[model samples]
Target: MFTEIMRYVLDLGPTVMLPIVVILFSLLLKMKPGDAFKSGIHIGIGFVGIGLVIGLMLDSIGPAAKAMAEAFDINLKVVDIGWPGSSPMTWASQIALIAIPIAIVVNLVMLMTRMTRVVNVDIWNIWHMTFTGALVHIATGSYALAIVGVVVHAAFVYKLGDWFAKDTRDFFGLDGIAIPHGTSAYLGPIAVLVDTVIEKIPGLNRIHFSADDVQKRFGAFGEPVTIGFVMGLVIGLLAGYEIKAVLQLAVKTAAVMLLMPRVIKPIMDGLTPIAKQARSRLQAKFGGQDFLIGLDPALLLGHTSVVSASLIFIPLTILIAVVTPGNQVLPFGDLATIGFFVAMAVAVHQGNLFRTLISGVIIMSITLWIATQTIGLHTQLAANAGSLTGDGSLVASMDQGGSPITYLLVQALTLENVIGLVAIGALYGIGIFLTWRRAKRFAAQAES
Candidate 1:
């Protein structure tokens, strides 16, 4: 019964699951019936709109990614199966059955104890955490350790979400909301640390630019559409396309830039009401203690810095993939997802374009190195889950498969060395300190 139920829930996808969650959460907050239903449906419609736009963008960008790779003669043995391909495989694994429940329990426990303020309802994204569990299971053949992996992964994101809730809310005007996503939000602290280091550099300290600064300096040319067009044209030319094809690609890219914000607007429209009620409920129950509405990083798509940074990273990712030795993954299907990876970094950097780019590049380099290291276990996990096709070729997920958290944990577990374990513990210990200090400061500010 449990197996069947989980399968059904997974099949509903986020488009259905998110709205269901929204409606239930609205009801939990004591919203009116009519208002709850309307908000829920609206949120559903917004997700559908986002899905359509992202799907279209991916369709257009996927081919361009391949063309550019081919143009550069970049060849690698490991095929980039992408996150879309990776997620379903993760769900098919034995770990999926427990990942959801484990994460929910951890989230609730954290919330109750005030260790975390985020109630993560982005259920579909738990696949990322589950993917980590699956890797551990494959690496050590221990279900017990796999469960531990899932719990730790959830705890990490929850704390990170709490740590950045303020910046997330302020940057996107999303009061009472936080993005606890595994991919982007995990990098928030790293970006913060790096930016702090850069702040002390004599030359770098004076260098700062943002999307707004570009628009102010260059007028219309700095607009997202213009930037998109120029970026697309450059990519197209690099792909060695004919002039007509290049122009078409440029227009298509411009369309994505113009369409993304339009798609996200309705999502915000639907989310705002729910957020207000959540804030109200928290205030009523706890004498005005603040809580965060945990959500997917997709909400940040409406930010121009995210869009601009993603556009800039495309060629940069391809370039790095080519030059970075020992990287087997090609990074094709999920190339368009560069925006999701750096959204939090851009927000943390306060939209400083230069800092965001440097941070994003470093993140990508790490992702590539980690993804390359995990190909063996990743391939094994896919086969164990029966997700491999008849081709028998090795496949990898460039984003989630490359997660630094997953890589570190699996390496520590498999090595069974005290030094490796201590290194992992120390790394997370600092992460906890960073997140806790930020959370402490946020709470102090709220109290005042």
Candidate 2:
């Protein structure tokens, strides 16, 4: 028992050590030692706690992986597609109980010491993205794919932050949202805010940010999981997990994926600019603003975009459900059902379509590739020559695809695309100069 406890403690290394490191760094940064240390401890505990919880929840009840398996009726122990083991919850608890607090402590220390200043709602956003990743996995049960999705999102966030400040704009796109080094946690809330604003102003549609797009586009992971679970339950019940049901889900989902992009485009086109304008105006109104990641609820409560998104939540979830893959007849509990509604509501409120759509495309491609390449589903990849008597057994194999979906999604991003979006935004931002464009328009409108 003692040995086991020691091993468990060792596994909790991140949670324990990060706080110490943050404290040392805080002292070096000239922070008040007591305050810095306390702050660091607080933040670290929070961070590690969240990660652990997410890991636990996903390990036990992930949708993405389950959906994928159900989609293909994947029951081949040879390929390691076993059901999720008991370890995920244990692991999640271990990590969250230990590591996240450390991360939070480090962040808080930095904030308190002026190594980094408090940014609005950034911590909240990071928390949201992390859970979103975990939740999506619960819905789909595509463990590997879910990891890729989460890692990509986290990396996108870190890169856009102060890690490489000069190049940050290049990474995130040209919405002019800025974050200095040492304040990385705020990326998500900023993403949420930008997305909300973009939905309100059509002229702002061209502007894009990487983080915002991830949430907007791929946020449907929850919806897809719900759909996939239902399909899986139905097929598992009636057909005993056959290939036909899997194919049906795949084809149907692919159709939905194809359709959602078009449906998503127009709403985003209208609100994109408005979000930018709202953010910019708010910033300018409060000079020397510190927090760029999240909007102040008190200030923004009356905003049209936020209200619109909340109203549209249910309708959007139904739209998303049509495209999500998985077997039918499975159950989706409150979290998933609520998650889709929240995702849609958040996406619509924020006006951040470009971010949502692009990230979504990447996730979709990755998901499709994973579903296709997973073995034992018996989808034919390579064609074979017939036997001498025109009688031959059809053999199925795996790993026959092009570059993996995760890699391809990253590769698809081009300098041209980012620049084009920014250029369009700048050109349209001239609407801010409405009075200059038509000095006489003021009198014209007054008379009318």
Candidate 3:
């Protein structure tokens, strides 16, 4: 009976299920039913918009990448679907709707127990936790463990938010906001270690530049549309295309760059009111406490350093994909907005392009490996969510799909990749510890 009901809900597709979930939660948060219903409809429409835009992206870039790979004989067969593709797909997963309530309850429990200093009200991001659970269910065929995966994932990101409160406030000027997004949060520890190591080096410590400096000098280059056209033009040229074909690729790529955020706006628009009300409620109840209000990583992309670093990493990430052994994901969808992966890292470096570059390289390299390692499950997840249709084409991602924490957790649960479990488990465990210590020091500073 339960399985049938869940299957029925899942079959409704994210377009309907998402609105249902949104309206239910909004009402629970005491929003007017009429307003909640509107938010739900807008969010549903936004998902449809995302699917169409991503279709345009895939239709335009997928073949160009394949052609480039053939000419270069690159072994990158899997397309890096990026957040544009993964977001809606994850939202479609079976665990997605329930994950929202679980995440909220988890946050409330953690807050009351004093287990974390971050109160995550970014309900939309519950998709991140659910993705972990959904993938675990796919890998192990255990819905029970899948829900556990969501529970653990939810607990972990609250802690991730706490760890980065200092950088979010000190560097990004997001005030009390804490980023709980998947890839950026998990990949942040490497940036912290890189920052500490750089501080130890005398000459590199002094080598610095600001996001504003890069912005002024490379005004046109920094624009996403410009980056898109140049990347497409260069890739088409390398694919040995004629001038006209190259120009066509350029315009198509430009369309994707310009259209992505426009499509994403409604998704945020729908969530913004719910997010605000949730925050207001939590703050009213817990305003006396020192807590970071968890928010989407999107809030960080406007920083000049992150935007500049994103543009620089576009070419750098493609270069990394080429050189990194065992990498199968052709860096495509994520290339236009690679900033999200490095947003926190850019802030960790405090807008030092020089340092951001070094840390950015480390972050993307790790991302590629994880993306490669998880390709089997990643492709399965996409296909399960109806995001993958072609017989031979496979999907991968560098955002949530490349998360080391998720990889480690699923591996540990299955015991299939014993060595991998040991390796990632050990390293990420240390990351968790160091991040906790860093949070306490910052928390102490605030108190003092």
Candidate 4:
């Protein structure tokens, strides 16, 4: 009875639950009661709209990719379940409820100790942090150990919030805002590694395909919406669709490209009032100290460059799945929200589309590789949480299931994958060090 009750609450999902919390926090932070109510609805509606757009991408692309794999006779078997399916399972896990308050309290303690410069009131992060905890719980089967996972990941994610402050602001055009949650944060070290390598390459460093370059060269046809249509048209053609179906997919893809940024507008607006209050109130009380408030990566795609790169990857991701050896995960669901995996790269590479795409290939490749390994864990976790479709499909997600941070942490705690842990740990450690040097320079010089 008790477990089912919490299940009922958690099942409301972030779309509904986050808005409710933001509304309460909006009021708690004294943003005027009426505006807070309105803000909450705005956020809820935006999330709903975001989901419908993702579904549009999924419904259109999942079949096409499946058909394409069949057409090419590729053996890509495991469906990348995406956040739509996987996140809900995280919310319902045993450690979820426990992780929330602990994460919040952890943020508070870090702020007081000057260890973290972020005041992350965004409750959606709990949805994400809960993921690692839930993964650790299933790995070790101890509630206490899982809570440890949540706390450790939370703090690390915050410093990541600090680390990426440079690229996040400088490239994304947000003033002092940081995005530390989700795939955009954890997978970023790979981007840093790829970025540093590209910079070192003499001829390759000269090539740039920033969005403005697209506009300047191809004119209107190079817009993100156009790229989206082209990508869809290509995929539709490759999937053996007739002309009419292909055009429809093309039109649908263009709409998702155009609409995702539109929905993001309201999400920004909904949170702005509370965001201002949080920043002002905290800075006001904390003696005007320097800090960066953590945010979501959706804010990154509101711009055009990342949108173009994301669309370009839609087809390329399928190609990646086809070309990768021993790869069974079809890049369907993650391809729909592909930006999360590659968004941070755009910032690190300074909106250079060529660099972003090169890094993106590396990003998607590693994610696909790891996603295959996690099919066992993800399938088991899904089963444990009653998240499996009765069809008994094996599940994995690119955003979280493939995250090396989560993979390494879970592998270390379980000791089931010793070789995997050491390899990923060393690689990720170097990326973090490089990113830290990059970030510290930003902190030292950005304001001045």
Candidate 5:
């Protein structure tokens, strides 16, 4: 009964759920009903456009990736099922029945107690928390432990969200917004630490290659559509596609680059007014306290760093998958989602194309390794959720399968590794402390 109910809600899809949330949040913040409804519908329409373009982009890229693999004869054992392939299974898990409410309560508790400044209204992504719970249930068969897993995951990701709020807002020009996206946002600390070292190196520090810089130097050639076109052409050529097919792919890629921001503009248009109104009310009610509106990482995709880094990584990810030892998952379906995975890292690197590319390579290497390690459990979960092809073939998710944070937590707890568990807890503490200090600095500046 519970699973069925969850299934129904999940089936309504993000297009429906996100707009409903927008309306609710708008109303909750005392916006005019007519304005709230209009914004909600606009946001909904924007998401639909995003979904369509992304779907088309994936349709082109996925085949190109598979063709590259075939051309190279890199026969990977596990199929790269992508997040779309895995998310349904995660949602169908028994734990998902309660994971939503458990995550909501955790978010509310954290917000009220000031443990976090991010008010996460991206409720559709609550599946990420539920996925953690489902993983726990798969490991221990304990509903209570599963709930604990969900709560812990939510708290940890929210804290990461808080840490990233400033960079996210500043980088994307979205004030009062933070991304609590687990898979994407988890690499915040790693990116920041790596970038700090790069900043210290004299030669590297002087070298700057960002999307804007590229455009400034190369003029029209560096525009995202041109970059996308060139990238698609390279992939198509490598995939051994005929010239006609290559040119077609290039056109499609250019379309995606051009259309993505047009769709995203409406979303920002919808969100901005809501964020401003909410900020005013919050400031009036509680003077001088910082509050961040939590959102999906999708909002950041409009950034040039995201598009450039992700475009560069498509071939790089395929190459890495081929060369990485013991990696069985050939990235295909989730190739389009490279932007989401790498956006925060690019932001942390201040949009330096060189730095972000290096960061992306390291990120994908680790991701492929993690995906290789978790194939068995992932296959089991998929089968139970009826997402399997019934051929007993192995499957993996490049995005969720590469979730090292969740993977480590599940292993540390399930294996009864006291040292490992303590290490995870300590790391969480470090993230909180660092973010707290950073937040204070930002708050002081705002005051000044």
Candidate 6:
């Protein structure tokens, strides 16, 4: 037992070293010792909570899922996949750490390119970016990735604090929508909805809240650690102990692909009130209410495509495991990609459900064709790719390559694959368009 635990811990290399580095970094940099302590405590609790959640879920819920599969004579693994697969959770963490810093740098570059010179380091960060960095750590599973996130963000945060002390940008300027940095970016939209409601509720108004505001409200030590632990545990358990299996970067990517819009609509709605309140108060303070918060579905679409590619990361070693010389396959990737389109297509907001449906299906078909053909310069191969002729059929070697198993499973891997995909696509199109379109139209009528 001791050896097994040791093996798991050792395999989790960066996790062991990250905190030590963080402690030293704080000491050498001469920043607040308390910040290092807090960050360390938060990460430690979060990781342990995640482990507990995974253990409980595997012990109880996983067996039930397996038993259900057996009733139909299906041979499903205990989790969808296991450790090697679950290892992708580290991918989530890495993407969160890596991409967000890049995004920050990119943002700075864009600003510089526009000739908007940023003289101070404080200009670079916001609190939501911290969450973005954390999510990257969750996706990647490399503890080193998490440490990198801490370092990058710490640089920006400390700089911002210094700027505030100098009396420029009086309040900590840390408000912005989250970047979908990691696999779980899908949840951001839902979180936005929750945040919108919390802010708009009459009693909740007139108070300040930031992600860091949690420290003031929850206290420094116990709360940060507790929140980290609870969140980690829930996410880890939902992930299953076989973190590599169920929590693959692709799975997390696919989940966010499906979930982004549901999460975003509430945010879109909330945007109105947030801007209104901020401007109202600001105008009172400065004699001008001048803040602009507008709607843009295009932002959502572009972000989705970029973040979903997070699904594509894997070391060549593990991938080579299942893809030998023969044509043996495991087709989860295809299905996951298809599921992404289906989810995107059905997402609707106004009463014109048919328009939504039609638009969605078109987007999927177009995306499929583009992805298989032109987008990656794989045109000739995608042209040779097989299609559904109202009868189920699948062929090998997609134009854009990855796991053979994913290709096989997605491309006629199941008996009713073609029919099921089309049917779901159709249903989602109709359902979402009708539901959302009607509400929107009704709101318009009320105005008229």
Task: Compare the candidates by TM-score and give the number of the best one.
Answer: 1
Off by over 4 Å in 4: 1-45, 174-177, 273-281, 288-296, 387-394
Residue-level lDDT of model 6, residues 95-145, one tens digit each, is 333443454464455344542212222111222233324433333445565
Task: Summarize candidate 5's per-residue lDDT along 79-172 as a digit string, tens digits.
Answer: 7877777777887777766777787888889888878888887777887887777777787778788878788888888888887777877888
Per-prediction TM-score to the true structure, in the order listed: 0.93, 0.31, 0.73, 0.87, 0.90, 0.27
Candidate 3 C-alpha lDDT tens digits along 205-283: 9886764564467896755556556767876787688999889978986776566566656766776787688778866
Point out where model 2 deviates above 4 Å. Answer: 1-12, 63-158, 162-362, 370-448
Best by lDDT: 1
Per-structure clash totals for the candidates: 0, 63, 0, 0, 0, 42
Return the lDDT, model 6, position 230: 36
Each candidate's lDDT (Cα)? 0.80, 0.33, 0.75, 0.77, 0.76, 0.32
Q: Output the better candidate (3/4) by TM-score.
A: 4
Model 2 worst lDDT run, 10 consecutive residues: 379-388
lDDT by residue for model 2 (1-448), tens: 6546635644555445545554564455455667555645654554454344334334323343344334543322222211122122223321223222333454555545554323323332233233323333433446554445445544433333322222222322213233321112222232333444555678766675433344367676534333334433443333343566545534433333233333323222322343354455544765432323321111111222222222222223223333445312111221111122223223322344355443233323322333333322221211111111223332221111111322223222322235433533343233223212232353256458
Q: Report the Cα RMSD per candidate.
A: 2.3, 17.1, 5.4, 3.1, 2.8, 18.5
Tell me the spans in candidate 3 whose CA falls farther than 4 Å from its real position.
1-73, 212-288
Runs in model 1 deviating more than 4 A are 389-392, 416-432, 442-446
Model 1 per-residue lDDT tens digits across residues 372-424: 87788888988888878788888888778888788778877787546645654
Candidate 6 error regions (>4 Å): 1-31, 73-448
lDDT of 1: 0.80
Candidate 1 vs candidate 6, TM-score winner: 1
